[PDB]
Every structure is written in structure tokens, then in C-alpha cells.
Amino acid sequence: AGVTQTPKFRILKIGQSMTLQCTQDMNHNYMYWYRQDPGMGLKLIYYSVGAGITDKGEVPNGYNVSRSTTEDFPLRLESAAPSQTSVYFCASSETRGAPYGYTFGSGTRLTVVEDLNKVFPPEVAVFEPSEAEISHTQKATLVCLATGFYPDHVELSWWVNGKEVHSGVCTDPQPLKEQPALNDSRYALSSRLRVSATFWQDPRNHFRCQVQFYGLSENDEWTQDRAKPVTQIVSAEAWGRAD
Amino acid sequence: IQRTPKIQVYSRHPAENGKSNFLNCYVSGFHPSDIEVDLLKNGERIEKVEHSDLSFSKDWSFYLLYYTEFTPTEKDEYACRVNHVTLSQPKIVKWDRDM
Amino acid sequence: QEVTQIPAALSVPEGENLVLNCSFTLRWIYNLQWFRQDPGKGLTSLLLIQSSQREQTSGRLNASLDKSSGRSTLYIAASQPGDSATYLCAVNNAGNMLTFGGGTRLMVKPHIQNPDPAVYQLRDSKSSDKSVCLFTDFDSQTNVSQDSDVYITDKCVLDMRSMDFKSNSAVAWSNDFACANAF
Amino acid sequence: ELFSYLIEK
Amino acid sequence: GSHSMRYFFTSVSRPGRGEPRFIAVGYVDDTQFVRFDSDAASQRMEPRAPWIEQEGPEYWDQETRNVKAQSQTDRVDLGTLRGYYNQSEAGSHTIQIMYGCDVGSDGRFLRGYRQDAYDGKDYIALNEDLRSWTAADMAAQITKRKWEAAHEAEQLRAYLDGTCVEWLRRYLENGKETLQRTDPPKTHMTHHPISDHEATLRCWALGFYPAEITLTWQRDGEDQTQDTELVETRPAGDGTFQKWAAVVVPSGEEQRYTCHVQHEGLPKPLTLRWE
């Protein structure tokens, strides 16, 4: 079990309230909340040295905590601000010195948006290998392209004949901004699956690019024409051919 | 374990009548830490009284210095009143300049 | 009283030994910790050096501790593409508690023995309209950077569980633009 | 300055 | 003379009144220079001597973090020790901590020490060798094993003969005008007849610094240690100290008794006789 931290993700409109739960059954007196912005280290928000006390960390402003019990150290965001877009890590330890090291939760990705209208699922297309490539190298590179998604929280995987593959797979390190200048820019992500000419030039082989998108929940309100951009899987697929 | 407070009442400077001074009450050798200390002028509690931060001796017994501004005279009687769990009654020690 | 990691990014050809640097101004530290962080994922503890220890070793990972100079170095022997990740230095003391450096993004570039650079055009599986440009088979020394109407991706990172058809590639697309010039 | 290598009893 | 830096900590559980009382005080010799009080408004380490005022923001930020850390450690320890002794939640308990270092007149390390108490009794003490612990009971013996595993002794020793003596030297230099001065005692003698055939002879020492002093009564030359009333050296509140020693004396034999005064600030030891 260790440290259990919920929810794993959440999209939240500016000024809305959220509570991040954090629970441990190890009877640890010390519990900690950290935040981590892109390409930065963890920064301590709040800590508790036991039931009945909390104390401010490095970056406590805009946050609240409580510790009525040893088990739970919940973090509250009263009025969600743009600056609170971050990844949150709860942790615990038996002692301050923590000779076995802190026990960390899995993390909570919070995205704060001007409105839920800014949230879009990915559009997904698979591009078939070039005849020029096949005849030059005897190899066949499929390209998958996920476009127009926000936020930038997706998991792209290749599925060949119903089983996930990793050999020949090469994914962009991070999603690309369609409008770099804009703060609310929708994202694009590309991936390659490279196989033998043989494996492509065969109509029995099935290639699926699967993009997991982390979006709105079902208890979120929606009054726009387009589909509610809920957490979902969007897929595009191609079939090999010899003719 | 319980230890009875020792009480010394005295002035910051040698007493000269009509000259601004400080009345001290040094309370030492007491355990536990909870204590009530008042400085009296003619039997009446002096409101504005300051004290040092709680500390203790090698034997773990606590000591505090209580002090307040006072102008000694011939007739005015000054005293320190200490209450502690170890005492039967609040102990009143009278300021005796000639001691 | 804080923790620092310079450089912030390191690019290394695979098989080559490398070093990641940690400096801290924290006094009377309990321990120093090195974490691995994969993108979108949480923390994996690599090494935990106690105040009383000068170093810790785990396989190809070796980390030194000099409390006096306030420095730790993480040694990665015979580096593999699978080592590619963000490495966080963390130092624990009473006053500050577990304090984190900014991290070093390690890119371990795969060795390409037979470069064959080329730009191919791929058509969409459903529509005849949409096409993509693929730049592939270039050596790990050459790099790709990004007109707001044409989008060019970074050279991809290999799936760190790959065992076949490993080579560098970048993708370019737009809404009429030609692939020959795209890169 | 205070001692700071704090270990719980 | 030789000098000391000492920190004193008092933690008192307040059952049903929320957080325990926490009072930290730092001393150079008998002068209080820093204070933390849990019940105070600031929640900062605060200056209490003029010579500490010249320490910058980093000093006050660091000492605030570290005194808060000790507070938090004491909060946990009150709970744990309550467990060790199987005591109810309804009773008030006290942890007391004193540690410090002594240097000679040459500024070099003489000794370091730490003693911990529970309810006004020895709990655990650092030994003279600064390498091992003496546990008072089976409760403290559990604490000893934890402190051995954490290498508490080795870290405390490094502080005691490093940071402790280094910052003592700095304080002694910065506040030398008060800390390294010697004020000799102004002395006098009082006479209080208790009966028609007996009288108290009280020997006074006022306005002396530092606090170390020897007031000794002698009859004809013989030391009267067994028959001398000797109050505790008390603070005047102006930075100086006061002390007296008294002897009950048969009337008309006052001239026989003599008070000897030994103090660093004296050119020669004083010998006093009654009017």
C-alpha cells in the first residue's frame, strides 16, 4: 500500500475548489506535500510532524492542509489559480531523518483552465509506409499523429495484431505546441512503428495507434455542441497489403 | 518529583528613597514549572511585571527573575508572593533593604 | 540552504561513462538521495547515502558524498538509452527536510552504425488528402529544430524496451507544402 | 548556534 | 577566564489545551542571548542580548527553522515517552534538554555535554568521552539503541567541538565589551542581633561580573563552611551579580570573625571585619 494519493489527475476551472487526498497505514508521524513544475524539482508546500499539527513549507501560499489523524494529510485548493497548474506529490516518513527514505505517492497532475471549453481530445491518424523507403531500405515506417488535444496528458501505444509492441517504436519526447506563443495552445504528438518490408507487405497484419487521453470526468457539467471531452482512448489503424 | 521554590526579594541598585529603581523577585529550585509570582506594593499586586525566560539548574529545578520599576520610600512596603503546588499557602517574602 | 544540479541537460552517446553533479548548502544532513523520474511518472529511489557513508553502488550506478564541500556526483557506467530520464538530487536535514535540486534531463543517444539519411512522404490510411513527411536514418550527431503553418517535431526517443529496427526519425506536416524542403 | 542533528527518542 | 555556550529546552504537555509549551533559551555564560517561546506571537528565534543583533537575516531564518525542528522533535518525544512509561493522556509531563561546550581563556575546547530529563529526573546523558550514552531506565535504554543506530553521539561530538566552540568564540568577540569584562565586587557587612547574646553577621558582594565568586567566613583563621548560610548567586538585572554569606555569632566576639572574597576582577582577595 505505502502512500495512497487521489485523484491521479484532475482538470479544474479557475476559482473552483479541490481536495487532494493522501493516506498511509504505516503509522508515520511525518507527512509532506510537494509540487513539481515542468523541468523543475519538488518544492515542499506543507508538512505535519503528527496528528493535531501542520506547518508551512517553502511554497504554502494558495494552499491549506489538516491532520486530525495519523493516517490522512489532505491538501485543499480553495480558489484554483493558473499558477497552481503542477504535479503534486504527497509523502510520509517514520522519523525526520528518514533513514529508509520518504515514502512517496504516485503523484497528482492538476491542470487549471480559463474554462472547460479549452479541453479537447486528440484526433488520431496512421500514415502508411513510403514505397520509396521500402524499396531503398527493405523497412516500413508507420507514422501515428495525434493532433488538437489539451491538456498535454496522453499515453501513445502501438498494437500489432491485438498485442502491444515496443520493438521498432519511437515516440516524440514531449507533445508539440500548435501555437507556441499561446498559454492555452492545443498539442500534437507523433510516433513511429518500423517493421520489415515483409511484415508490412502482408494483408494479415493489423497496426493500431492507441492514444489514451486524460480529460474531464462524468460529474463535470457541459453545455457545448461538441462531445464532452472526457477521459477516453482515440485510435487510428492501418492494414498491411501485398497488392 | 517535587521541589519547593527558594525566593529572594531585592533591588537592582542599592536603595535610595525617592530614586527610580527595579524591584526583583528571584525564584529558584522549583519543580514542576507551573508557578504564580506577584510583586506587591502595600499588599497590592503591581500590574506591569516582567520576567526572564524559564531556565533550570544542573538538578533540573527551574528558576525565573521577576522585576518591575519602583521608587523606594521610607513607609512603602514591597513584597513577592509565590504560589506553587509544593507550598501549603502562597509564600509572601517582604523586601528588607537592611538585610 | 538549497540544492543545485549543473548541468540542467546532458546529451551522451551510449556506451560512454558519464557524471551528473549535485551541490547543496544544507548543513548536518541526515542523507542524500538520487531519484529517477520518467516523463509523466513519479519518483524511483536509485541510491540513498547516509551522513556516515562516503558512497553507495547499485550495478552501473555509483554516487559519492562529500558533506564538507557540499557535493555529490552520480557516476553512470557504460550508459544505455534506457538510462535516459530526469535525475533528481535530494538532501535531507532537520531545518529544511528533504530538499530537491532542479534535476538533470539525461539524453543517452543510440549509436547508428549505418546512417542512411532520407526524407519520405507517407499518405493517410483513410483519406487521400492528408500526408506526413518522415526524416529518418540520420546519425545521433545531427539535430532537428522547428513558419507557424508547418510543424516539425524533435528527433524521437526510442521505446526503452525495443529490440529491433532502432534508428533516429523526425516528422513534419502542414495544411500546399513539399517534403523535399520541409527539413 | 543550535545543534540540528535531531533524532527522536 | 573560561567560557560556555548552553541551550536549555523545556517541553510541557498541556492535556486538553492543545500544543505543548516549548521554551528554548541560549546562554553565553550566564547571559541569555536568544529565546523561542511557543506561546509568543512572533514564532521566531528572538534576540535577548545586544551583541546578537548584528547577525543577519540568514542567522535568524536558520535558528528559527532549527528551534522549530527541536520543538517538533520534543512534541513527538512527549508522545513516545508517555508510551514508554504507560502514562494516561490526562497528566502533564516535562522534557528538559541542556547541551553546551566550554572553552578556556585561550578560546580552545575544554569539554562538551548533553543531559536529557523526563519529569525532573535523569533520562539519558552523553558520557564524558562524547562517544556513548548513560540511560537512566529501560525507557531511556530504548532511546539509546535508536541514538546509537542514528550515530547521534558522533554528530553531537562534531557539533560540540566544532560549530558550538566556533560560534561561542564569535559571540565572545562580538559581545566582548560585556562577555569578557571583569567587574570586582563592591563589598560591605551588616549586623542583625537575633537575641541579647547572638547576632547574624552577613557579608555582601554586589555589582560583580562574572558570577563565579567565593564568599568564605573564618573564626580566628578556621573555616566555618559547616556554619555559614550561603544564598544562591542572584542576578541584579543590570548585567551584574549579587551574593551574601552569613554567620550566627556570640555578641561581643564579632572582631574575631573575618569574611574572605575571591573574584577574578579583584587585584588581591579582600578580607572584611565588622565596624
Side-chain angles (χ1 to χ4, degrees), chain C residues 34 43 53 114 166 173 175:
Chain C
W34 283 96
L43 301 185
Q53 294 170 334
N114 305 285
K166 287 175 287 195
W173 78 96
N175 320 313

Short mmCIF file of all heavy atoms in Angstrom, two decimals, chain C residues 34 43 53 114 166 173 175:
data_model
loop_
_atom_site.label_atom_id
_atom_site.label_comp_id
_atom_site.label_asym_id
_atom_site.label_seq_id
_atom_site.Cartn_x
_atom_site.Cartn_y
_atom_site.Cartn_z
N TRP C 34 19.45 10.07 -4.68
CA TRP C 34 19.32 10.23 -6.15
C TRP C 34 18.05 9.52 -6.61
O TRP C 34 17.87 8.35 -6.25
CB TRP C 34 20.57 9.70 -6.86
CG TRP C 34 21.74 10.62 -6.78
CD1 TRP C 34 22.76 10.56 -5.88
CD2 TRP C 34 22.03 11.74 -7.64
NE1 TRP C 34 23.66 11.57 -6.11
CE2 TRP C 34 23.24 12.31 -7.19
CE3 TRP C 34 21.38 12.33 -8.73
CZ2 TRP C 34 23.82 13.42 -7.80
CZ3 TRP C 34 21.95 13.42 -9.34
CH2 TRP C 34 23.16 13.96 -8.87
N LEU C 43 8.56 9.19 -8.64
CA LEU C 43 9.99 9.08 -8.26
C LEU C 43 10.36 7.61 -8.06
O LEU C 43 9.56 6.87 -7.46
CB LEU C 43 10.23 9.89 -6.98
CG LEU C 43 9.89 11.38 -7.07
CD1 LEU C 43 10.28 12.09 -5.78
CD2 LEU C 43 10.56 12.03 -8.27
N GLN C 53 28.26 7.70 5.49
CA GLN C 53 28.74 6.96 4.29
C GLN C 53 29.36 7.93 3.28
O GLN C 53 28.87 9.07 3.16
CB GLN C 53 27.59 6.18 3.65
CG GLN C 53 27.05 5.07 4.53
CD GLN C 53 25.77 4.46 3.99
OE1 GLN C 53 25.00 5.10 3.27
NE2 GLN C 53 25.53 3.21 4.35
N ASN C 114 25.17 2.57 -39.35
CA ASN C 114 24.95 2.69 -40.82
C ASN C 114 23.90 3.77 -41.10
O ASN C 114 22.78 3.46 -41.47
CB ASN C 114 24.58 1.34 -41.43
CG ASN C 114 25.60 0.27 -41.10
OD1 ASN C 114 26.69 0.26 -41.68
ND2 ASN C 114 25.28 -0.60 -40.16
N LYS C 166 15.89 -0.05 -34.68
CA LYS C 166 16.22 1.16 -33.88
C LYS C 166 17.00 2.14 -34.77
O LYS C 166 18.11 1.78 -35.24
CB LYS C 166 16.99 0.77 -32.62
CG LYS C 166 16.15 0.11 -31.54
CD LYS C 166 16.95 -0.38 -30.35
CE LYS C 166 17.77 -1.62 -30.65
NZ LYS C 166 18.24 -2.27 -29.41
N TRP C 173 4.60 18.06 -40.89
CA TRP C 173 3.28 18.13 -41.58
C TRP C 173 2.78 19.58 -41.62
O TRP C 173 3.34 20.43 -40.89
CB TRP C 173 2.28 17.19 -40.90
CG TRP C 173 1.70 17.71 -39.62
CD1 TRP C 173 0.50 18.36 -39.47
CD2 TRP C 173 2.27 17.61 -38.31
NE1 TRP C 173 0.30 18.67 -38.15
CE2 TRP C 173 1.37 18.22 -37.41
CE3 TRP C 173 3.46 17.06 -37.80
CZ2 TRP C 173 1.62 18.31 -36.05
CZ3 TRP C 173 3.70 17.14 -36.45
CH2 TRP C 173 2.79 17.76 -35.58
N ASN C 175 -0.81 22.18 -43.72
CA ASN C 175 -2.11 22.27 -44.45
C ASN C 175 -1.97 23.28 -45.60
O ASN C 175 -1.51 22.86 -46.67
CB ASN C 175 -3.26 22.68 -43.52
CG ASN C 175 -3.19 22.03 -42.15
OD1 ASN C 175 -2.98 20.83 -42.03
ND2 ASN C 175 -3.36 22.82 -41.10
#
